[PDB]
Design a binder for these strands. Structure first.
Ligand SMILES: [Mg+2]
Ligand SMILES: [Mg+2]
Ligand SMILES: [Mg+2]
Ligand SMILES: [Mg+2]
Ligand SMILES: [Mg+2]
Ligand SMILES: [Mg+2]
Ligand SMILES: [Mg+2]
Ligand SMILES: [Mg+2]
Ligand SMILES: [Mg+2]
Ligand SMILES: [Mg+2]
Ligand SMILES: [Mg+2]
Ligand SMILES: [Mg+2]
Ligand SMILES: [Mg+2]
Ligand SMILES: [Mg+2]
Ligand SMILES: [Mg+2]
Ligand SMILES: [Mg+2]
Ligand SMILES: [Mg+2]
Ligand SMILES: [Mg+2]
Ligand SMILES: [Mg+2]
Ligand SMILES: [Mg+2]
Ligand SMILES: [Mg+2]
Ligand SMILES: [Mg+2]
Ligand SMILES: [Mg+2]
Ligand SMILES: [Mg+2]
Ligand SMILES: [Mg+2]
Ligand SMILES: [Mg+2]
Ligand SMILES: [Mg+2]
Ligand SMILES: [Mg+2]
Ligand SMILES: [Mg+2]
Ligand SMILES: [Mg+2]
Ligand SMILES: [Mg+2]
Ligand SMILES: [Mg+2]
Ligand SMILES: [Mg+2]
Ligand SMILES: [Mg+2]
Ligand SMILES: [Mg+2]
Ligand SMILES: [Mg+2]
Ligand SMILES: [Mg+2]
Ligand SMILES: [Mg+2]
Ligand SMILES: [Mg+2]
Ligand SMILES: [Mg+2]
Ligand SMILES: [Mg+2]
Ligand SMILES: [Mg+2]
Ligand SMILES: [Mg+2]
Ligand SMILES: [Mg+2]
Ligand SMILES: [Mg+2]
Ligand SMILES: [Mg+2]
Ligand SMILES: [Mg+2]
Ligand SMILES: [Mg+2]
Ligand SMILES: [Mg+2]
Ligand SMILES: [Mg+2]
Ligand SMILES: [Mg+2]
Ligand SMILES: [Mg+2]
Ligand SMILES: [Mg+2]
Ligand SMILES: [Mg+2]
Ligand SMILES: [Mg+2]
Ligand SMILES: [Mg+2]
Ligand SMILES: [Mg+2]
Ligand SMILES: [Mg+2]
Ligand SMILES: [Mg+2]
Ligand SMILES: [Mg+2]
Ligand SMILES: [Mg+2]
Ligand SMILES: [Mg+2]
Ligand SMILES: [Mg+2]
Ligand SMILES: [Mg+2]
Ligand SMILES: [Mg+2]
Ligand SMILES: [Mg+2]
Ligand SMILES: [Mg+2]
Ligand SMILES: [Mg+2]
Ligand SMILES: [Mg+2]
Ligand SMILES: [Mg+2]
Ligand SMILES: [Mg+2]
Ligand SMILES: [Mg+2]
Ligand SMILES: [Mg+2]
Ligand SMILES: [Mg+2]
Ligand SMILES: [Mg+2]
Ligand SMILES: [Mg+2]
Ligand SMILES: [Mg+2]
Ligand SMILES: [Mg+2]
Ligand SMILES: [Mg+2]
Ligand SMILES: [Mg+2]
Ligand SMILES: [Mg+2]
Ligand SMILES: [Mg+2]
Ligand SMILES: [Mg+2]
Ligand SMILES: [Mg+2]
Ligand SMILES: [Mg+2]
Ligand SMILES: [Mg+2]
Ligand SMILES: [Mg+2]
Ligand SMILES: [Mg+2]
Ligand SMILES: [Mg+2]
Ligand SMILES: [Mg+2]
Ligand SMILES: [Mg+2]
Ligand SMILES: [Mg+2]
Ligand SMILES: [Mg+2]
Ligand SMILES: [Mg+2]
Ligand SMILES: [Mg+2]
Ligand SMILES: [Mg+2]
Ligand SMILES: [Mg+2]
Ligand SMILES: [Mg+2]
Ligand SMILES: [Mg+2]
Ligand SMILES: [Mg+2]
Ligand SMILES: [Mg+2]
Ligand SMILES: [Mg+2]
Ligand SMILES: [Mg+2]
Ligand SMILES: [Mg+2]
Ligand SMILES: [Mg+2]
Ligand SMILES: [Mg+2]
Ligand SMILES: [Mg+2]
Ligand SMILES: [Mg+2]
Ligand SMILES: [Mg+2]
Ligand SMILES: [Mg+2]
Ligand SMILES: [Mg+2]
Ligand SMILES: [Mg+2]
Ligand SMILES: [Mg+2]
Ligand SMILES: [Mg+2]
Ligand SMILES: [Mg+2]
Ligand SMILES: [Mg+2]
Ligand SMILES: [Mg+2]
Ligand SMILES: [Mg+2]
Ligand SMILES: [Mg+2]
Ligand SMILES: [Mg+2]
Ligand SMILES: [Mg+2]
Ligand SMILES: [Mg+2]
Ligand SMILES: [Mg+2]
Ligand SMILES: [Mg+2]
Ligand SMILES: [Mg+2]
Ligand SMILES: [Mg+2]
Ligand SMILES: [Mg+2]
Ligand SMILES: [Mg+2]
Ligand SMILES: [Mg+2]
Ligand SMILES: [Mg+2]
Ligand SMILES: [Mg+2]
Ligand SMILES: [Mg+2]
Ligand SMILES: [Mg+2]
Ligand SMILES: [Mg+2]
Ligand SMILES: [Mg+2]
Ligand SMILES: [Mg+2]
Ligand SMILES: [Mg+2]
Ligand SMILES: [Mg+2]
Ligand SMILES: [Mg+2]
Ligand SMILES: [Mg+2]
Ligand SMILES: [Mg+2]
Ligand SMILES: [Mg+2]
Ligand SMILES: [Mg+2]
Ligand SMILES: [Mg+2]
Ligand SMILES: [Mg+2]
Ligand SMILES: [Mg+2]
Ligand SMILES: [Mg+2]
Ligand SMILES: [Mg+2]
Ligand SMILES: [Mg+2]
Ligand SMILES: [Mg+2]
Ligand SMILES: [Mg+2]
Ligand SMILES: [Mg+2]
Ligand SMILES: [Mg+2]
Ligand SMILES: [Mg+2]
Ligand SMILES: [Mg+2]
Ligand SMILES: [Mg+2]
Ligand SMILES: [Mg+2]
Ligand SMILES: [Mg+2]
Ligand SMILES: [Mg+2]
Ligand SMILES: [Mg+2]
Ligand SMILES: [Mg+2]
Ligand SMILES: [Mg+2]
Ligand SMILES: [Mg+2]
Ligand SMILES: [Mg+2]
Ligand SMILES: [Mg+2]
Ligand SMILES: [Mg+2]
Ligand SMILES: [Mg+2]
Ligand SMILES: [Mg+2]
Lengths: 100, 63
RNA sequence: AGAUGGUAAGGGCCCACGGUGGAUGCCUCGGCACCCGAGCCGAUGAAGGACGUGGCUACCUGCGAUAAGCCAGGGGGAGCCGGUAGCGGGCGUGGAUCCCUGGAUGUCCGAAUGGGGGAACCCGGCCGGCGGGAACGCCGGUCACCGCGCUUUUGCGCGGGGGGAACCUGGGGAACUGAAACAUCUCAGUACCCAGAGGAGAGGAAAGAGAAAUCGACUCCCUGAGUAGCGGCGAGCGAAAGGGGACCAGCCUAAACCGUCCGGCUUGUCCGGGCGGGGUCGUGGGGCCCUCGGACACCGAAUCCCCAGCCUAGCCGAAGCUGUUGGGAAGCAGCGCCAGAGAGGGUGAAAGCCCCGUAGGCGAAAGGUGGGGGGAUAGGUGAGGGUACCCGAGUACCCCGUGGUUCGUGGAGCCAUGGGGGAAUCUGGGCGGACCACCGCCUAAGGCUAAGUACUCCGGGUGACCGAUAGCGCACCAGUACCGUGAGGGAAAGGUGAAAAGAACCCCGGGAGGGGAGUGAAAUAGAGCCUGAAACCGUGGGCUUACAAGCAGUCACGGCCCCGCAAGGGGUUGUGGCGUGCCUAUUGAAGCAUGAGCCGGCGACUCACGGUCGUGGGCGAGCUUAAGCCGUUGAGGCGGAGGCGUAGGGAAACCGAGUCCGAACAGGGCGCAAGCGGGCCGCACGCGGCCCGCAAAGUCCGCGGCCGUGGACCCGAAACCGGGCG
RNA sequence: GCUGGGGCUAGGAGUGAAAAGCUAACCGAGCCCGGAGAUAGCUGGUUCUCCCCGAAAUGACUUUAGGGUCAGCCUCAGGCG
RNA sequence: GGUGGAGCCUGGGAGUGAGGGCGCGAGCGAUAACGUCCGCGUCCGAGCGCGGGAACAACCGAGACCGCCAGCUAAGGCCCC
RNA sequence: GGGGAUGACCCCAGGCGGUAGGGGAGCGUUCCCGAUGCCGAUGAAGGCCGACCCGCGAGGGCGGCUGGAGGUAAGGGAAGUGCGAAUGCCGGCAUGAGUAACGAUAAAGAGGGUGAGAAUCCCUCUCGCCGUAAGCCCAAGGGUUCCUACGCAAUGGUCGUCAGCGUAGGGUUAGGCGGGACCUAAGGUGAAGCCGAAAGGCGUAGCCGAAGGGCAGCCGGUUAAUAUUCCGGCCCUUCCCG
RNA sequence: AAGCCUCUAAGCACAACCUGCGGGAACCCGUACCGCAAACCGACACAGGUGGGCGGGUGCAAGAGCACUCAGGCGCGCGGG
RNA sequence: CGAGGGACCCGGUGAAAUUGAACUGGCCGUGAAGAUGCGGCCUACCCGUGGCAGGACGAAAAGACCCCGUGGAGCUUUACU
């Protein structure tokens, strides 16, 4: 029942992947496995012909997730991105007076 | 638990200060008729040899 | 005439590579023990189950025909429709999912309770409703028993039945063992069976204790103390008083006297009962009468009210970047930052500054607790004299038979009594251990009482606690599969990868199974897949065996092969020589005495309380803490109740460097002083005793040997008893 | 006489045309749990290495001879010399 | 005389109390037993470590700390194994 | 015993077989102080080797291969601390061994079909066996084992395309059949009552209790699976209403 | 013992009971398959045991015995030399 | 002597108790007194298939006979209570 440190929507930045740093838009969050699938790691995952949604022989489909402890959320005009604060009349996320 | 003093030993023998065990002589209580003044008289707290190392073991907590 | 090489159906040794096999190494979602918080549920239907519910549902879990749920409130703020995938669908800032509280429904069984019943089924009575509804079915209320109050009988309200890991009280109650048999005794009033109540229970305000004219309810810990004592005086069992502490609360009622009503009836002047005032005592108290008077002032709940606080949801909460090896940085290198936070865990690896939280501070609409703190009420408040009316009836007391206290019949008290006899009401009684007198203590024959103490189903934190043969029987869909009619017994079974990125696609093959290709840091990391040993089964290479006899080995010579520049070394035995497996039990084993098919894992001399001896320390005629109290929650002090020894004899009285045996200074047994480091010359060589070894002299702790009680180095009976199942 | 169905009888007890048979495949007193980790002077087992010394199977006694207490034999530590 | 894992005293700690063979002094036996039970000594047990006796614990020699492709000897042998 | 630089380093003399035992000195494993540390992807624990080095040793270092994330000095402590034996236990794999057996001596043979694969599956033609059953109908008992379709992961004492084996979908239709809304026997429970420390044990009336009594159904067809139930004919019973 | 036949008590005799004539209602469980075996009990597709009924024909005097054979099934789930 | 089911061969599935490792000859002696393993002599190329059971003091059961245990039970009596 851990919540997240990012929202759905809000722009997030990776830190400790195979690639080191690119800007993406988090879709989706998935807090069950605690792993975001933002835009970065395309995967070559195999898929059987049975259905067929791709009627030749395909070998690539949807995505692969990345662990949420790697990523960090940016404030939209700053370059600051590492910290979190809350609690001004509504639980937002504001650091270094950058908006959510 | 804490060991118990052998009450037969406590009522029969008396240990002295320097480790010696003092107890009476036998052959006196039941029949004393056909005995001389020597054999009646010489009941004079005999000493026990090499058994007091197994006799002060049950005269143990109060000695 | 002669002779070495040589043949390997097959074997043996060594080396390399595989398969079966799942030990070791590493992690935990796990249980184990300690600490506290907390501790009953339930006819307004408990604990626990049967059955069913998901669009499709096998199971687990949550729920109950309103059925992975509904309504209200609070938290929470962006993902959801449980584990849990897959097809197919719709929800959310107009606050979804999730957590907590209060509600509603809650089929059927189960105390089961309308009745029957072989539990999860069947059949009903009365009152209303529905189906065309008379006959048939369904739904919503009520209908079991017992004890009380009202109701004169009818009936209406209040409780109880059953279960609960451990604990407690009462009523019954063993046997093996120990005495190296064994019947009294111990085990033991323990295991076990029944009853009720509890968050504790029991006990509790002296007819007490026991020697001091003393203490002053009760419970628990340490002492006293293994002491006094009991015991075939054997085995062994075993206090109490007092003290230091934790806690501290004391009360209610009958009786004598009085008012109402009812009952018997001589309706007299009295008896019997329930209510209202009146009393709770040993300094004797109290009823009635007289005097002192003033309470209209004070105390105060264990009852009730409110509230601080705690619990059932949670929230805020400081501080970092760059480059390199690599797939991955958290490592490494540079410059920094925070700290009331450098505990832990996760993050492709090893992070205070990536995340969750630890430091610290906030948080209750609603429901429980509220022993803590403020208020109210019930209830208590006094002295002298007279009277001798009352102070707990088959009861005290006596006798016989009994249980408990250490008390087993002994001199046998006291506490309750199964039976027999049997009173008194303060000039009456009980106790101070047969008993008598004196002197002291207390009022029995009615009842209640929190706090301190035991235990953990459950919640969390800790651990020189463990790591899938460990740990609870179960870390896993376990009290399950399975065995037994049943009581009951009772398992094994964790690990791919950072991310399934779980191998699309081609080929052989019926499929399975793979060979390629590809993802992947690794595919001998391939789906019960981390590391993957040994026994075991094979494949390939070197040596040697078809005229040699041995618990199979060791030594020597030589041949062959392989390393090393060489010196040298490693595998094999053709021959020579020498040679009776391991352990136990034994006078004696290679033994035709026992155990062992092989490999991997589990396992056998500890611990509590004490005694003796030795050793390392501290102190020394002194040493020394226990229980408990005060402190951060990995920190210590306080706390001389107590114990050993300093003087010992004697059975005790009693005496004391002496005691006892005894008339005795005869004599003897117990102890006694005999001097170790010893400048001690104080100036008298009697040296009195000194710098001075921490010792004659002992205590506390540690570490070892041994011993007693505990199961006590482990395994293994034939049997006995209690409760039940057949 | 044989047998189906519903029952009753049980552990020092039941039943038995009587063997001490049967009582859930084993009955001179069942089975399950608990006391109970009962007891066993009676078998077996008891796990790393090195060094120093080194036994005894004898005597005196026990409802006792296959086990014991003391002495004898051995070792360690402290003293005598 | 004898300085030796000789003795004496105290304390701690076990084990042993089924022994057997050989020579002598004996008993029972049958002057039989690798038979039973004592004493005097040794050995095995505990030296199944070694050489000889063909092989064998007590018959003889000898008391194995380890190593060497060194000698001398004890008992027993010198025709070959 | 000595040189006594007290040397815990070397000389001299003697000794060094050994069970039960007595004593002394060390090695290894789990965890803890040291540890808010050190080592570790340039590779930790563990596994396989070494003809390497040190040690009289239990062993410890160093080198190579595999492995993928932990280990921990020096100096000490606490033990659930060292295994080859217990007709020990647990798990695996051997010998027995390609050996016995393959389950009544009722009996098989042949031609086609399906299928990759047929002595074993389906059809056809012969032969044999039971036929007071080795046939049919019920009650016990068992609980989907019944039928169809698709398959051989496992099972069938061989194979198997078959299966009483696995997956999925269907299938049990009652006023008259058997039970309850009817009754009762043995026996059980049990108002009243009796007895017993408690649990409880007897027990009238009444209740439960059956392959016992009573009660209204016969024939034929239908499916792959239901039949005295569904259907066709035909006959009855109970209760209520006018 | 109940259904059913008959006589009555309280009660009712505008009720109640019986026979006809027409119209309605009839509830809960079992129901497949094996059921003398491969599906029951025996750890097994086990040569064992399992209650009731039909259980034919021909010949032996008869008969549920014997021999064969209708309807019905079966060749026994390892075979070939 | 003949017949069938096994035994024997082949195709398929394929255990079991036992088991220290074994490269396991005979005789004569020794050894705990009944030798494949010890000593001497003789025989024997290695490995199998079918059969006999004389040996491995072969297997099963920790002798079921006897003795001991101050073991435990069943039974008897003028043994005790
Ligand atoms: Mg990087
Ligand atoms: Mg004392
Ligand atoms: Mg070959
Ligand atoms: Mg390999
Ligand atoms: Mg291997
Ligand atoms: Mg495996
Ligand atoms: Mg009620
Ligand atoms: Mg419930
Ligand atoms: Mg469920
Ligand atoms: Mg709100
Ligand atoms: Mg809000
Ligand atoms: Mg989901
Ligand atoms: Mg989908
Ligand atoms: Mg979906
Ligand atoms: Mg939407
Ligand atoms: Mg809300
Ligand atoms: Mg909602
Ligand atoms: Mg609720
Ligand atoms: Mg309801
Ligand atoms: Mg009921
Ligand atoms: Mg009932
Ligand atoms: Mg009505
Ligand atoms: Mg109506
Ligand atoms: Mg109507
Ligand atoms: Mg109630
Ligand atoms: Mg108790
Ligand atoms: Mg009692
Ligand atoms: Mg007894
Ligand atoms: Mg005894
Ligand atoms: Mg007692
Ligand atoms: Mg109760
Ligand atoms: Mg109760
Ligand atoms: Mg309490
Ligand atoms: Mg209390
Ligand atoms: Mg109480
Ligand atoms: Mg009380
Ligand atoms: Mg009182
Ligand atoms: Mg006290
Ligand atoms: Mg006090
Ligand atoms: Mg009154
Ligand atoms: Mg009053
Ligand atoms: Mg309140
Ligand atoms: Mg936060
Ligand atoms: Mg933070
Ligand atoms: Mg970085
Ligand atoms: Mg960290
Ligand atoms: Mg850093
Ligand atoms: Mg906090
Ligand atoms: Mg309350
Ligand atoms: Mg309080
Ligand atoms: Mg009076
Ligand atoms: Mg008495
Ligand atoms: Mg009394
Ligand atoms: Mg009495
Ligand atoms: Mg009295
Ligand atoms: Mg008295
Ligand atoms: Mg009183
Ligand atoms: Mg707990
Ligand atoms: Mg386990
Ligand atoms: Mg493991
Ligand atoms: Mg069963
Ligand atoms: Mg790649
Ligand atoms: Mg692969
Ligand atoms: Mg591949
Ligand atoms: Mg493998
Ligand atoms: Mg697998
Ligand atoms: Mg891993
Ligand atoms: Mg593996
Ligand atoms: Mg080969
Ligand atoms: Mg020759
Ligand atoms: Mg040759
Ligand atoms: Mg040789
Ligand atoms: Mg051993
Ligand atoms: Mg011996
Ligand atoms: Mg042997
Ligand atoms: Mg042998
Ligand atoms: Mg033996
Ligand atoms: Mg054996
Ligand atoms: Mg004197
Ligand atoms: Mg004297
Ligand atoms: Mg002195
Ligand atoms: Mg000690
Ligand atoms: Mg019979
Ligand atoms: Mg019994
Ligand atoms: Mg009897
Ligand atoms: Mg009888
Ligand atoms: Mg029997
Ligand atoms: Mg028996
Ligand atoms: Mg036992
Ligand atoms: Mg006992
Ligand atoms: Mg003894
Ligand atoms: Mg020696
Ligand atoms: Mg001795
Ligand atoms: Mg000495
Ligand atoms: Mg000596
Ligand atoms: Mg003896
Ligand atoms: Mg003797
Ligand atoms: Mg002798
Ligand atoms: Mg002899
Ligand atoms: Mg002789
Ligand atoms: Mg000797
Ligand atoms: Mg020998
Ligand atoms: Mg010789
Ligand atoms: Mg010898
Ligand atoms: Mg020597
Ligand atoms: Mg010479
Ligand atoms: Mg020298
Ligand atoms: Mg010399
Ligand atoms: Mg030695
Ligand atoms: Mg020894
Ligand atoms: Mg461990
Ligand atoms: Mg490093
Ligand atoms: Mg490497
Ligand atoms: Mg480790
Ligand atoms: Mg590998
Ligand atoms: Mg152990
Ligand atoms: Mg083993
Ligand atoms: Mg065996
Ligand atoms: Mg085994
Ligand atoms: Mg063959
Ligand atoms: Mg054969
Ligand atoms: Mg054979
Ligand atoms: Mg055969
Ligand atoms: Mg045949
Ligand atoms: Mg054919
Ligand atoms: Mg054909
Ligand atoms: Mg054809
Ligand atoms: Mg055929
Ligand atoms: Mg049935
Ligand atoms: Mg079955
Ligand atoms: Mg099935
Ligand atoms: Mg088919
Ligand atoms: Mg198959
Ligand atoms: Mg098969
Ligand atoms: Mg096919
Ligand atoms: Mg079928
Ligand atoms: Mg099927
Ligand atoms: Mg009925
Ligand atoms: Mg009805
Ligand atoms: Mg009835
Ligand atoms: Mg009746
Ligand atoms: Mg009856
Ligand atoms: Mg009855
Ligand atoms: Mg009854
Ligand atoms: Mg009937
Ligand atoms: Mg009938
Ligand atoms: Mg019809
Ligand atoms: Mg009648
Ligand atoms: Mg049928
Ligand atoms: Mg049918
Ligand atoms: Mg039949
Ligand atoms: Mg069967
Ligand atoms: Mg068969
Ligand atoms: Mg059969
Ligand atoms: Mg029959
Ligand atoms: Mg004729
Ligand atoms: Mg005829
Ligand atoms: Mg016949
Ligand atoms: Mg036919
Ligand atoms: Mg056939
Ligand atoms: Mg066949
Ligand atoms: Mg067959
Ligand atoms: Mg046959
Ligand atoms: Mg064959
Ligand atoms: Mg011989
Ligand atoms: Mg040999
Ligand atoms: Mg020979
Ligand atoms: Mg034979």
């Amino acid at each position: 029942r851990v919540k997240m440190h990012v929202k759905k929507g809000d722009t997030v930045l990776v830190a400790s992947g195979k690639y080191k740093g690119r800007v993406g838009k988090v879709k989706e969050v998935l807090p069950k496995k605690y792993a975001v699938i933002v835009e970065g790691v395309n995967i070559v995952k195999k898929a059987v012909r049975v259905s067929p949604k791709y009627p030749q022989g395909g070998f690539i489909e949807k995505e692969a997730p990345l662990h949420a402890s790697k990523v960090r959320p940016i404030c939209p005009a700053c370059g600051k991105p590492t910290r979190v604060r809350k609690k001004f009349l509504e639980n937002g996320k504001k650091i270094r007076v950058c908006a959510k | 638990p804490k060991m118990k003093t052998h009450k037969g030993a406590k009522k029969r023998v008396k240990i002295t200060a320097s480790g010696k065990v003092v107890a009476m002589k036998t052959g006196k209580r039941h029949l004393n008729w056909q005995k001389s003044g020597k054999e009646i008289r010489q009941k004079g707290r005999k000493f026990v040899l090499a058994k007091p190392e197994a006799e002060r073991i049950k005269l143990l907590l109060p000695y």
